[PDB]
Ligand binder design. Structure first.
Ligand SMILES: [Mg+2]
Ligand SMILES: [Mg+2]
Ligand SMILES: [Mg+2]
Ligand SMILES: [Mg+2]
Ligand SMILES: [Mg+2]
Ligand SMILES: [Mg+2]
Ligand SMILES: [Mg+2]
Ligand SMILES: [Mg+2]
Ligand SMILES: [Mg+2]
Ligand SMILES: [Mg+2]
Ligand SMILES: [Mg+2]
Ligand SMILES: [Mg+2]
Ligand SMILES: [Mg+2]
Ligand SMILES: [Mg+2]
Ligand SMILES: [Mg+2]
Ligand SMILES: [Mg+2]
Ligand SMILES: [Mg+2]
Ligand SMILES: [Mg+2]
Ligand SMILES: [Mg+2]
Ligand SMILES: [Mg+2]
Ligand SMILES: [Mg+2]
Ligand SMILES: [Mg+2]
Ligand SMILES: [Mg+2]
Ligand SMILES: [Mg+2]
Lengths: 177, 52, 136, 84
RNA sequence: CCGACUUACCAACCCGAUGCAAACUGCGAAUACCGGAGAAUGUUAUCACGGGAGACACACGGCGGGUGCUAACGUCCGUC
RNA sequence: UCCUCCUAAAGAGUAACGGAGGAGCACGAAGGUUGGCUAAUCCUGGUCGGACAUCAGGAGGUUAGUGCAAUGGCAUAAGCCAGCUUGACUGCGAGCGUGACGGCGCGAGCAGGUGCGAAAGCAGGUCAUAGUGAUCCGGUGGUUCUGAAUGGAAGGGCCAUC
RNA sequence: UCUCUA
RNA sequence: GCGGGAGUGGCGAAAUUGGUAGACGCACCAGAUUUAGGUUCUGGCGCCGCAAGGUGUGCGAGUUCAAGUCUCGCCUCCCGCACCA
């Protein structure tokens, strides 16, 4: 709750200043963080899905929800109902604590890290990024793993526009560019 | 017409039986249902037997 | 030759052709060729009258065709008895009621539109007349 | 020699008429259990003292006169039995 | 690598205008049909049961239609 | 032979070697109940990831879905998830529909015993309409109903069923 | 064992 | 005119209940053998294409998550049949 306290004390005062909002409830806030791993290669073996969920459970201390195919497509050789990915929804304190470990540990551990994009805000403030390699989190042991996975992080916030989320993350010193 | 026919014999000692069908390929395990026995006027477990 | 690209069904009842028409006013262009009689116009008759007025205007001006042949017409072959199914689709017609504007034209003078539509109506089985764009 | 004989018609079939419709109209006194409407869907719907069958058949649960009426936001047609 | 621009080969959606449909309907009759009430009229014309049948090859004409060529003293249905 | 639509003329019904399509099953859950949920498609962003997997938001508002053909229905969902389960009960059935008949169908309610639900209540198979075959003959289980002098038995009858 | 032609 | 059947690479030919399409062979190309050619031996080989992928069963739409296989229509070829007066 280190960043939640830092939000409640300094970000709200900052955004109320830099936007001149009538109410404090009009301010943005983060709502959830969704962690998807689309594993399309589990049609070869279930164990690839079963170990990627084990890896993502170490990153965020939750058991992941194994997602399935909404429908059947033949270009990918899948039928409707096959377990095809895994997700984790993060809310509350576990959200803040992961978001701390993200921008403090894992983003610096990116090979050739040079910033994020400010063109990844889905028109309505909600930010989405994708990491190339799961070893940037220190939860994973390097010798113990075998396969380089990848996941994508999706921060869903209550910002109406795109810039109010851009300023919110910049208030959390989020390394755009 | 792969869905063959069977009979559900009362386990109450009576020779009462309901007749019904099943797919013996996909459901190899025996069907056991709790049905009414009009002789005993109780609900008793019936078990799958051959239609014979 | 005009013809629907797709149809939901291949054949149609013979129907009737009673009633007055709906495409009465000159919508788009300035001059029109209005049907007075009743009947059906084939796609050949339509395309021949289009050719006769396109040549009569020397591709000057713009020509609309208000009608479209969407009714399939079956025929039985020669030396075939009256049973054994409905005949094969041979051609396509448009049912024409009185008042239907068949063609429109502008970009040309009135007298030229008169002589073009006269050359076209001489290729059409039904009796026509010449109309102009009326205000209201 | 010449009777080019031939053809057929893949389209000879049709089914039997199920005799659906409204068996008792409005203002028409019925006994309890009398079938009012036989129908596929719920083209009509059951109101007061009117049951809906397995095949969406509307029958009278009581005795009295048939009342057709339109209710609801969807403007659906309800059939009710007035008391008598 | 990005592609620079202009074409005429066009063109999705959307918008406006305009037609068509037996197997289209955000509308919708006339008639017909069912039920109720009320006169007048009609040799109960109505229903039920029982005795005896015949008939189940129809025709044209009108209207609504299918098929055919909106051909047939054609053909198949509905109604008189 | 059966089902769906049109022809079919706004009740029912209505023919042709008229126009078009399907059925001769499936399901022990794809049934019952309680509780909850709500689609197709498209747009933007996003690791492998691509026209099209999974993820987040927005438009949209059922253009989807319904075990299968078509039509009619479906948000109180009849559509989609999970829990518990066997009402895919037995005897009856007022009263109606439909047929020349054989026959087919709907059915509240009654008695018994049951399942879910806190409960009101719901459940006598599946959203409905196709998924089928008379009688005879013969087989199997049950039942003293009968039992050709008498007692049994055979055989027959009745019930279920092939 | 087989082994054509220029 | 009626019905049954088939149409795939340069060629002959396969594929199953719809889960990529070319297995195979012939030919063609190239290599080595040989004084040279043939044979014989090895390796390639549907079309566009940057090495990475795309378009591809007669033609046109449909069906399906997905067709060579399902529909339908058009087409071409083969066969059989086209009778009594
Ligand atoms: Mg003959
Ligand atoms: Mg109509
Ligand atoms: Mg007769
Ligand atoms: Mg007769
Ligand atoms: Mg006669
Ligand atoms: Mg007659
Ligand atoms: Mg007549
Ligand atoms: Mg006629
Ligand atoms: Mg005639
Ligand atoms: Mg006659
Ligand atoms: Mg008639
Ligand atoms: Mg009718
Ligand atoms: Mg009528
Ligand atoms: Mg009509
Ligand atoms: Mg529910
Ligand atoms: Mg995506
Ligand atoms: Mg259900
Ligand atoms: Mg159904
Ligand atoms: Mg016999
Ligand atoms: Mg005895
Ligand atoms: Mg004796
Ligand atoms: Mg020599
Ligand atoms: Mg294949
Ligand atoms: Mg002879």
């Amino acid at each position: 709750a280190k960043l939640h306290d830092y939000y409640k004390d300094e970000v709200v005062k900052k955004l109320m200043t830099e936007f001149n909002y009538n109410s404090v409830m009009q301010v943005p806030r983060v709502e959830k963080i969704t962690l998807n791993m689309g594993v399309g290669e589990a049609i070869a073996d279930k164990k690839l899905l079963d170990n990627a969920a084990a890896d993502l459970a170490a990153i965020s201390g939750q058991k992941p929800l194994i997602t399935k195919a909404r429908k059947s497509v033949a270009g990918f050789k899948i039928r409707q109902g096959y377990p095809i990915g895994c997700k984790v929804t993060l809310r509350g304190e576990r959200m803040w604590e992961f978001f701390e470990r993200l921008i403090t540990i894992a983003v610096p551990r990116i090979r050739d890290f040079r910033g994020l994009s400010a063109k990844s805000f889905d028109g309505r403030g909600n930010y989405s990024m994708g990491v190339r390699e799961q070893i940037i989190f220190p939860e994973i042991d390097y010798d113990k793993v075998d396969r380089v996975r990848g996941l994508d992080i999706t921060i869903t916030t209550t910002a109406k526009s795109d810039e109010e989320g851009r300023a919110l993350l910049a208030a959390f010193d989020f390394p755009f560019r | 017409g792969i869905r063959e026919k069977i009979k559900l014999v009362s386990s109450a000692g009576t020779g009462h039986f309901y007749t019904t069908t099943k797919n013996k390929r996909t459901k190899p395990e025996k069907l056991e249902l709790k049905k009414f026995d009009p002789v005993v006027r109780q609900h008793v477990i019936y078990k799958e037997a051959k239609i014979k | 030759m005009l013809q629907p690209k797709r149809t939901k069904f291949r054949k149609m009842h013979k129907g009737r052709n009673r009633g007055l028409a709906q495409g009465t006013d000159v919508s788009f262009g300035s001059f029109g060729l209005k049907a007075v009689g009743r009947g059906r116009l084939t796609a050949r008759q339509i395309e021949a009258a289009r050719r006769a007025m396109t040549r009569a205007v020397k591709r000057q001006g713009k020509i609309w065709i208000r009608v479209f042949p969407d009714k399939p017409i079956t025929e039985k072959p020669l030396a075939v008895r009256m049973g054994k199914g409905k005949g094969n689709v041979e051609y396509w017609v448009a049912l024409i009621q009185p008042g239907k504007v068949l063609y429109e034209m502008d970009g040309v003078p009135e007298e030229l539109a008169r002589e073009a539509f006269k050359l076209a109506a001489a290729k059409l089985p039904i009796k026509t007349t010449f109309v102009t764009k009326t205000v209201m | 020699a010449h009777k080019k004989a031939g053809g057929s018609t893949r389209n000879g079939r049709d089914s039997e008429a199920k005799r659906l419709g409204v068996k008792r109209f409005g203002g028409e006194s019925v006994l309890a259990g009398s079938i009012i409407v036989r129908q596929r869907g719920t083209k009509f719907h059951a109101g007061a003292n009117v049951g809906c069958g397995r095949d969406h058949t509307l029958f009278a649960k009581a005795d009295g006169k048939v009342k057709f009426e339109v209710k609801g936001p969807k403007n659906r047609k309800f059939i009710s039995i007035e008391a008598e």
